[PDB]
Paper text:
[name] is a 3′−5′ DNA helicase that comprises six domains: a 3′ binding domain (3′BD), a winged-helix domain (WH), two helicase domains (HD1 and HD2), a cysteine-rich region (CRR), and a C-terminal domain (CTD). [name], which is a homodimeric paralog of ssDNA-binding protein (SSB), stimulates the DNA unwinding activity of [name] and forms a stable complex with [name] bound to replication forks that have ssDNA lagging strands.
Analysis of this class resulted in a 3.2 Å global resolution map that included EM density for a [name] monomer, a [name] dimer, and each arm of the replication fork DNA substrate. In addition to lagging strand binding, [name] binds the leading strand and parental arms of the replication fork to create a multi-point binding surface that recognizes structural features characteristic of abandoned replication forks and D-loops. Well-resolved EM density showed lagging strand ssDNA from the replication fork threaded through the pore, with 8-9 nucleotides stretching from the replication fork junction to the end of the pore. [name]/[name] interaction in this arrangement buries ~1600 Å2 of surface area (calculated using the PISA server) and is supported by a network of well conserved and electrostatically compatible residues from both proteins. These include Asp438, Ser481, Thr482, and His483 from [name] interacting with His26, Glu39, Arg44, and His81 from [name]. Binding to the CRR places [name] at the edge of the [name] pore entrance where [name] directly engages ssDNA extending from [name].
Numbering used by the authors:
A (entry chain H): 2 to 111, 200 to 732
B (entry chain A): 2 to 84, 87 to 100
C (entry chain B): 2 to 98
Amino acid sequence: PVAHVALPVPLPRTFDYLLPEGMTVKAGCRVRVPFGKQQERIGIVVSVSDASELPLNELKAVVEVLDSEPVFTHSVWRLLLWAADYYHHPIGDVLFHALPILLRQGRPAANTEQATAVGAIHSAADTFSAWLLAGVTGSGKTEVYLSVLENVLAQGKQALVMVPEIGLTPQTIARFRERFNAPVEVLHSGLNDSERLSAWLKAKNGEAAIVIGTRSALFTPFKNLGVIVIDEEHDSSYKQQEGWRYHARDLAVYRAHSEQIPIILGSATPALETLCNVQQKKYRLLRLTRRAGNARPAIQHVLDLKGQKVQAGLAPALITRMRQHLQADNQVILFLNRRGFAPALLCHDCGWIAECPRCDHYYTLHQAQHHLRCHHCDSQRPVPRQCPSCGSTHLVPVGLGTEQLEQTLAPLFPGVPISRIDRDTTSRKGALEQQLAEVHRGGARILIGTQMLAKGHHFPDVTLVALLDVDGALFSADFRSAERFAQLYTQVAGRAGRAGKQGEVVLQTHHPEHPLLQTLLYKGYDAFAEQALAERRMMQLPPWTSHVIVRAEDHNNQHAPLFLQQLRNLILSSPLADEKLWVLGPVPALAPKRGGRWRWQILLQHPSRVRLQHIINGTLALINTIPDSRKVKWVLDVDPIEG
Amino acid sequence: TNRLVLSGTVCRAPLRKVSPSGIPHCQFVLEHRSVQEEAGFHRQAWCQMPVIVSGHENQAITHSITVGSRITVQGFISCHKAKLSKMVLHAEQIELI
Amino acid sequence: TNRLVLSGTVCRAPLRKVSPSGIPHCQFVLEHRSVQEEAGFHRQAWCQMPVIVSGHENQAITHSITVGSRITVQGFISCHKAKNGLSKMVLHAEQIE
DNA sequence: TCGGCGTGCTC
DNA sequence: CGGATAAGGGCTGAGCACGCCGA
DNA sequence: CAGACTCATTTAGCCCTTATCCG
Ligand SMILES: [Zn+2]
Ligand SMILES: [Zn+2]
């Protein structure tokens, strides 16, 4: 017979090979098969048939069959096929991305509310029931997770736990190991190849009970899967943006649906699409707001910035409040989503500003290292002494950064230690721990940091949270920027105060009368989420429609526009396409130049995702008629999180 | 001590008017482009200077100041508020080339 | 040729906002009061031309300015840039008493 | 006379 | 002291025989 | 006082290079 073999090649076609007599294969079995006259690569058998497009005598033979048993389970294989068809990616790459690295070369396969929620989850058993846990930060999400996991393990099944970042794995595996006598295992890119293969084998055998990992742990087969748990589903780490661009949450929901197992999504700030599904009765919500253990909510204040004597970006009222809080032996934390000393260097004579030729972006100034660094291509440049245009020597730093803030708050506070944490100062694993060790010592301290302050780290001695330079989320072209800013603000403000001490939050902005800020400050995140969801319902947005963006990169900004215009013409000239389909013309992306190559995009909008998928499949089948398809890098991104 | 020497080309058109007191007045804007020294490093200097000469007899040069490779004006300088001409020049000595 | 000679008192306290890689700068405003006389009538000279001192060579003389003192600053005239066009006209001091 | 760059295909 | 292993980086997440053009 | 919507943080290939542990 003839066996269809998929190979790690960016082509949406499965090659056909002839099996010599005496050898049989099944679906999803690795086969060592020659490919040309270069090397005998490793492929995966998709299906076996009797007829081929080419003559049977023309086909080649297979050297050896690595495995007599499919590496993927039936559910995993079905999910892989469905994802490959849905994301319009070549099947071979999709299949090989879900395999361990060692197996790719053919190596031997070898409270009252909490109780009610737990009872409801237990009652809804042996059925595909998707649940969403929403509550204030600091609630008993981990307690509910432990309860549902022990209830599932009572039947002897397994469990899967997903976290957005690697750094959060120890803080939860410690609790899981303490509570549960059953073995647990981790699986992420941080581990070595042998450890990942051992985790894969243990999950397949079924000896391991709980598998904890990032989005790459979703493809691990399980002997008997009982429940899938997703923590912090709104994080952007679940969406891959390189190679195969899938979303972990959607694939996990599909896996739960196919296997008919409960799935629990927990997040303090649920995503807009999750809330839309909740409104659409697709999900079931559970609100566990219990004051996070009799903890008083923080006090929110808005301070006008116009017409104020700002000292290093701080208002006098903010300075007085910080001094008052520090006098009471309590730490203070300041949020500034910037890096370096100055975001740009400006000439005082002619207005010249240093700009990266490869990015069309202003260089960022670092004073400790004394150089100009680009934050988009990591280019290294020295600090200029004279302006290249006019020759003046009056270059002045402009803008505010964390390094400048740390430098300039030293004179204001005489005996208050200053601690700064960001990506620049956290290049070493031990560096993070010692800086967190200093914070845990208590006393008085000022913390300056980027959004790294919103991670799993919890500071029990901080009472005041101040946000600086929050502008940019109110005048952005992106429609998702407000949601992201609200999620970040809720995460940062949720850490203010403690059970005993009352927290205070101060926001500095030039537009205190903006409806967004007022709604987010004087009302909870849920009210803003509902208002934004209704507003998007009034418009046509991805929470209520389907968006597919075809990005194209050009080395000389010449072939991408014409290629995208031809693609748009093919999209419009198709019987599958209807009037309701909305396709935007070729326009530059939010970043017209990122790595020396221009970027252009096409946005496709349709109320139904299945119709859009059919249209895209037809167009992809019709791509071969488009000339000059080479020398242009283009990808398809389904449901983008940016742009 | 208040004096200025400046060399530059003319800009726009040289307006010539007669004051009610009988002293002719000429107003024009000078374009300057030169390189000077600043902290030991050479850099270019440029500015636009309106010149309002109020001479009577020695201002005969103004008849041929519309075209000139090098126009040099020397004398007193003083500026003033304008509630958009803030920096003005009203020297008397004018030299060509 | 761009050279300006001026004398007067100081209006605003000097500022010492330093620049990256050294090369400090001095920011202060000069106040000048004098009179001008010629054939026919007399003129008045008064405004607030700013003066800029750059480089570490002249740093030792920028001291003891305080708020008001009779000083003479020599140098050329150059313009600046801002959101309101020229928006000012500073003086690049070369020789200081 | 010889190296650098733009195409199909591999079952 | 040699083998095996852990940590870090730099472009790339398909590539080679073939034919054409400039040096 | 001098730029506007941003920025900034995150996980996951691949071959080549460098430094470290163990028998
Ligand atoms: Zn300049
Ligand atoms: Zn760059």
